[PDB]
Design a protein around this motif. Structure first.
Motif, PDB file in Angstrom:
ATOM      1  N   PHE A   1       0.785  -1.235   0.000  1.00 33.33           N
ATOM      2  CA  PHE A   1       0.000   0.000   0.000  1.00 33.33           C
ATOM      3  C   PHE A   1       0.816   1.284   0.000  1.00 33.33           C
ATOM      4  CE2 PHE A   1      -2.124  -3.259   2.714  1.00 33.33           C
ATOM      5  CZ  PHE A   1      -2.914  -3.771   1.684  1.00 33.33           C
ATOM      6  N   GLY A   2       2.128   1.197  -0.210  1.00 36.68           N
ATOM      7  CA  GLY A   2       2.936   2.399  -0.234  1.00 36.68           C
ATOM      8  C   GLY A   2       4.416   2.161  -0.461  1.00 36.68           C
ATOM      9  N   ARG A   3       5.198   3.043   0.165  1.00 41.01           N
ATOM     10  CA  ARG A   3       6.647   3.054   0.024  1.00 41.01           C
ATOM     11  C   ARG A   3       7.366   3.800   1.148  1.00 41.01           C
ATOM     12  NH1 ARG A   3       6.189   6.866  -4.923  1.00 41.01           N
ATOM     13  NH2 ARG A   3       4.947   8.586  -4.074  1.00 41.01           N
ATOM     14  N   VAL A   4       8.663   3.517   1.329  1.00 39.92           N
ATOM     15  CA  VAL A   4       9.473   4.269   2.281  1.00 39.92           C
ATOM     16  C   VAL A   4      10.375   5.163   1.444  1.00 39.92           C
ATOM     17  CG1 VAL A   4      11.249   4.105   4.108  1.00 39.92           C
ATOM     18  CG2 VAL A   4       9.383   2.578   4.110  1.00 39.92           C
TER      19      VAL A   4
ATOM     20  N   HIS B   1      -4.194  -3.445  10.648  1.00 43.05           N
ATOM     21  CA  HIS B   1      -2.758  -3.643  10.560  1.00 43.05           C
ATOM     22  C   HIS B   1      -1.960  -2.348  10.496  1.00 43.05           C
ATOM     23  CE1 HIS B   1      -3.750  -7.824   9.104  1.00 43.05           C
ATOM     24  NE2 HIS B   1      -3.090  -7.924  10.234  1.00 43.05           N
ATOM     25  N   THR B   2      -2.403  -1.361   9.704  1.00 47.50           N
ATOM     26  CA  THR B   2      -1.701  -0.080   9.620  1.00 47.50           C
ATOM     27  C   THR B   2      -1.893   0.756  10.879  1.00 47.50           C
ATOM     28  OG1 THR B   2      -3.528   1.074   8.661  1.00 47.50           O
ATOM     29  CG2 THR B   2      -2.056  -0.024   7.106  1.00 47.50           C
ATOM     30  N   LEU B   3      -3.022   0.553  11.581  1.00 50.04           N
ATOM     31  CA  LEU B   3      -3.265   1.202  12.858  1.00 50.04           C
ATOM     32  C   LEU B   3      -2.399   0.542  13.930  1.00 50.04           C
ATOM     33  CD1 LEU B   3      -7.132   1.611  13.010  1.00 50.04           C
ATOM     34  CD2 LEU B   3      -5.464   3.345  12.429  1.00 50.04           C
TER      35      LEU B   3
ATOM     36  N   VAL C   1       7.221   8.812   9.964  1.00 45.72           N
ATOM     37  CA  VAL C   1       8.566   9.324   9.733  1.00 45.72           C
ATOM     38  C   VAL C   1       9.508   8.723  10.766  1.00 45.72           C
ATOM     39  CG1 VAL C   1       9.892  11.421   9.470  1.00 45.72           C
ATOM     40  CG2 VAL C   1       7.504  11.442   8.857  1.00 45.72           C
ATOM     41  N   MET C   2      10.257   7.708  10.326  1.00 43.83           N
ATOM     42  CA  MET C   2      11.235   6.972  11.120  1.00 43.83           C
ATOM     43  C   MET C   2      12.656   7.496  10.985  1.00 43.83           C
ATOM     44  SD  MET C   2       9.908   3.295   9.975  1.00 43.83           S
ATOM     45  CE  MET C   2       9.512   4.019   8.411  1.00 43.83           C
ATOM     46  N   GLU C   3      13.569   6.930  11.780  1.00 43.77           N
ATOM     47  CA  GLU C   3      14.977   7.272  11.702  1.00 43.77           C
ATOM     48  C   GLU C   3      15.551   6.675  10.419  1.00 43.77           C
ATOM     49  OE1 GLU C   3      19.290   6.502  13.372  1.00 43.77           O
ATOM     50  OE2 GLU C   3      17.885   6.341  15.007  1.00 43.77           O
TER      51      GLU C   3
ATOM     52  N   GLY D   1       4.436  -3.641  10.410  1.00 45.40           N
ATOM     53  CA  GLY D   1       3.174  -3.759   9.714  1.00 45.40           C
ATOM     54  C   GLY D   1       2.319  -4.926  10.178  1.00 45.40           C
ATOM     55  N   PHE D   2       2.922  -6.083  10.478  1.00 46.79           N
ATOM     56  CA  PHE D   2       2.160  -7.228  10.971  1.00 46.79           C
ATOM     57  C   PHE D   2       2.190  -7.373  12.481  1.00 46.79           C
ATOM     58  CE2 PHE D   2       1.144  -8.106   6.854  1.00 46.79           C
ATOM     59  CZ  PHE D   2       2.053  -8.815   6.069  1.00 46.79           C
ATOM     60  N   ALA D   3       2.872  -6.461  13.192  1.00 45.45           N
ATOM     61  CA  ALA D   3       2.950  -6.501  14.648  1.00 45.45           C
ATOM     62  C   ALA D   3       1.616  -6.232  15.323  1.00 45.45           C
ATOM     63  CB  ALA D   3       3.930  -5.472  15.177  1.00 45.45           C
TER      64      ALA D   3
HETATM   65  O1  BD2 Z   1      11.126  -0.119   6.683  1.00 46.12           O
HETATM   66  C1  BD2 Z   1      11.959   0.389   5.909  1.00 46.12           C
HETATM   67  N1  BD2 Z   1      11.993   0.016   4.619  1.00 46.12           N
HETATM   68  C2  BD2 Z   1      11.629  -1.339   4.226  1.00 46.12           C
HETATM   69  C3  BD2 Z   1      12.560  -2.501   4.533  1.00 46.12           C
HETATM   70  N2  BD2 Z   1      11.829  -3.756   4.533  1.00 46.12           N
HETATM   71  C4  BD2 Z   1      11.710  -4.281   3.178  1.00 46.12           C
HETATM   72  C5  BD2 Z   1      10.353  -3.922   2.586  1.00 46.12           C
HETATM   73  C6  BD2 Z   1      10.306  -2.441   2.224  1.00 46.12           C
HETATM   74  C7  BD2 Z   1      10.309  -1.597   3.490  1.00 46.12           C
HETATM   75  O2  BD2 Z   1       9.085  -1.079   4.027  1.00 46.12           O
HETATM   76  C8  BD2 Z   1       8.189  -0.631   3.012  1.00 46.12           C
HETATM   77  O3  BD2 Z   1       8.622   0.013   2.030  1.00 46.12           O
HETATM   78  C9  BD2 Z   1       6.829  -0.897   3.122  1.00 46.12           C
HETATM   79  C10 BD2 Z   1       6.378  -2.011   3.841  1.00 46.12           C
HETATM   80  C11 BD2 Z   1       5.001  -2.272   3.955  1.00 46.12           C
HETATM   81  C12 BD2 Z   1       4.073  -1.421   3.339  1.00 46.12           C
HETATM   82  C13 BD2 Z   1       2.702  -1.658   3.425  1.00 46.12           C
HETATM   83  O4  BD2 Z   1       1.966  -1.244   2.512  1.00 46.12           O
HETATM   84  C14 BD2 Z   1       2.113  -2.350   4.488  1.00 46.12           C
HETATM   85  C15 BD2 Z   1       1.424  -3.540   4.223  1.00 46.12           C
HETATM   86  C16 BD2 Z   1       0.814  -4.254   5.267  1.00 46.12           C
HETATM   87  C17 BD2 Z   1       0.903  -3.776   6.573  1.00 46.12           C
HETATM   88  C18 BD2 Z   1       1.590  -2.593   6.848  1.00 46.12           C
HETATM   89  C19 BD2 Z   1       2.193  -1.872   5.813  1.00 46.12           C
HETATM   90  O5  BD2 Z   1       2.856  -0.744   6.092  1.00 46.12           O
HETATM   91  C20 BD2 Z   1       4.534  -0.308   2.622  1.00 46.12           C
HETATM   92  C21 BD2 Z   1       5.898  -0.040   2.518  1.00 46.12           C
HETATM   93  C22 BD2 Z   1      12.852   1.338   6.387  1.00 46.12           C
HETATM   94  C23 BD2 Z   1      12.592   2.009   7.595  1.00 46.12           C
HETATM   95  C24 BD2 Z   1      13.487   2.962   8.069  1.00 46.12           C
HETATM   96  C25 BD2 Z   1      14.651   3.253   7.345  1.00 46.12           C
HETATM   97  O6  BD2 Z   1      15.513   4.168   7.801  1.00 46.12           O
HETATM   98  C26 BD2 Z   1      14.909   2.596   6.143  1.00 46.12           C
HETATM   99  C27 BD2 Z   1      14.009   1.637   5.663  1.00 46.12           C
END
Ligand code: BD2
Ligand code: OCT
Length: 339
Positions: A43-46, A76-78, A108-110, A175-177
């Motif tokens: 559902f997105g990106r970092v 899950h996102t909550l 917004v993480m480290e 995300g799954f925690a």
């Molecule tokens: O978490 C980081 N990036 C990662 C490293 N893990 C590999 C997968 C990609 C990814 O996290 C995501 O890009 C990501 C993950 C999940 C979702 C998502 O849509 C999602 C789905 C189900 C439940 C929760 C969710 O957030 C969106 C983006 C990350 C965090 C901090 C950092 O400084 C650098 C990288």
């Protein structure tokens, strides 16, 4: 065991103070400059962003609210945000800010410039048992902390761990925690790390994470996961069978720890017995491990990521750079009222 009991007691009270009254809306998107995509998910990106006033680098996770609703995973996102906001441990990635707008959710993480453990494991082929043990010790303590807080981290895998500037782990992807007292039933995680309970649709608990650790340690020491196949159906049959083969180079201590971690019967699995986490901490594979020095990060790391300043993105790979679309109208405001 008093030093650990009073430690974990101050840890649950610090956590619940944050858990019961969460922080909301601590920043805005226009206070950050966009640099590069570091990863993607369902559902997105970092994204690496730069805070305009302080000049600090941050990793911003952007999730599309409508894509979440569509494939029902709102909970899950909550879960992800509330837990991240509430925890605090040296091997967990820190959530600095959170907010939402008309279209998206933002965390917004480290920024951890060393990149994912997956990249370095693949590049090196496999880690030595001292190197894998260094990482495994950190996961053991991280889960001891998280399980104390009634949290299950349901996605341990090399892609979900980041290596920092001191060579230590920063666990991400919450995300799954989930916080649960007892069992849960959601079919989630990643195929080759799934415990038999999850595959067989049972009510599972924290023991699922200790199976995942067995798989993680096998993968770090071997270069590949214990259960592999082309189709998920064939991976699952191999997991549910009580059979696993070990490389010859594995020590007898490692093979013994892995048989007890990769125990298909959850009532007999290490980390889920009467003695708890200590069946693992006292196992002969961890005999040389100084647990308080690992926690205090006094141990010399077997690998330091090569990078320049704190904002270098060399250790992360390249992804297509897409627009951050924020709609003029608020979407699904009701479902995400708690974020
Ligand atoms: O978490 C980081 N990036 C990662 C490293 N893990 C590999 C997968 C990609 C990814 O996290 C995501 O890009 C990501 C993950 C999940 C979702 C998502 O849509 C999602 C789905 C189900 C439940 C929760 C969710 O957030 C969106 C983006 C990350 C965090 C901090 C950092 O400084 C650098 C990288
Ligand atoms: C999880 C350890 C015990 C918690 C005591 C109260 C804080």
């Amino acid at each position: 065991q008093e030093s650990v009991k009073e430690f974990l007691a101050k840890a649950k009270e610090d956590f619940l103070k944050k858990w019961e009254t969460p922080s909301q809306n601590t920043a805005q998107l226009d206070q950050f400059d966009r640099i590069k995509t570091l990863g993607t998910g369902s559902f997105g990106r970092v994204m690496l962003v730069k805070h305009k006033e302080s000049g600090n680098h941050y990793a911003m996770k952007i999730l599309d609210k409508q894509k979440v609703v569509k494939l029902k995973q709102i909970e899950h996102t909550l879960n992800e945000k509330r837990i991240l906001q509430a925890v605090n441990f040296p091997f967990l990635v820190k959530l600095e800010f959170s907010f939402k707008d008309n279209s998206n959710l933002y965390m917004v993480m480290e920024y951890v410039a060393g990149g994912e453990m997956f990249s370095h494991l693949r590049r090196i082929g496999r880690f030595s048992e001292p190197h894998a043990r260094f990482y495994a010790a950190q996961i053991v303590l991280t889960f001891e902390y998280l399980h104390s807080l009634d949290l299950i981290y349901r996605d341990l895998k090399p892609e979900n761990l980041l290596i920092d500037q001191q060579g230590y782990i920063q666990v991400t992807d919450f995300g799954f925690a989930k916080r649960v007292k007892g069992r849960t039933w959601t079919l989630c995680g990643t195929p080759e790390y799934l415990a038999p309970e999850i595959i067989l649709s049972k009510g599972y608990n924290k023991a699922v994470d200790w199976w995942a650790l067995g798989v993680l340690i096998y993968e770090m020491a071997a270069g590949y996961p214990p259960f592999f196949a082309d189709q998920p159906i064939q991976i699952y049959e191999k997991i549910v069978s009580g059979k696993v083969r070990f490389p010859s180079h594995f020590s007898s201590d490692l093979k013994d720890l892995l048989r007890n971690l990769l125990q298909v019967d959850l009532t007999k699995r290490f980390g889920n017995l009467k003695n708890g986490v200590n069946d693992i901490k006292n196992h002969k594979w961890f005999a040389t491990t100084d647990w308080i020095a690992i926690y205090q990060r006094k141990v010399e790391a077997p690998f330091i990521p090569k990078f320049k300043g704190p904002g270098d993105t060399s250790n992360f790979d390249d992804y297509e750079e897409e627009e951050i679309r924020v709609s003029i109208n608020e979407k699904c405001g009701k479902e995400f009222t708690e974020f």
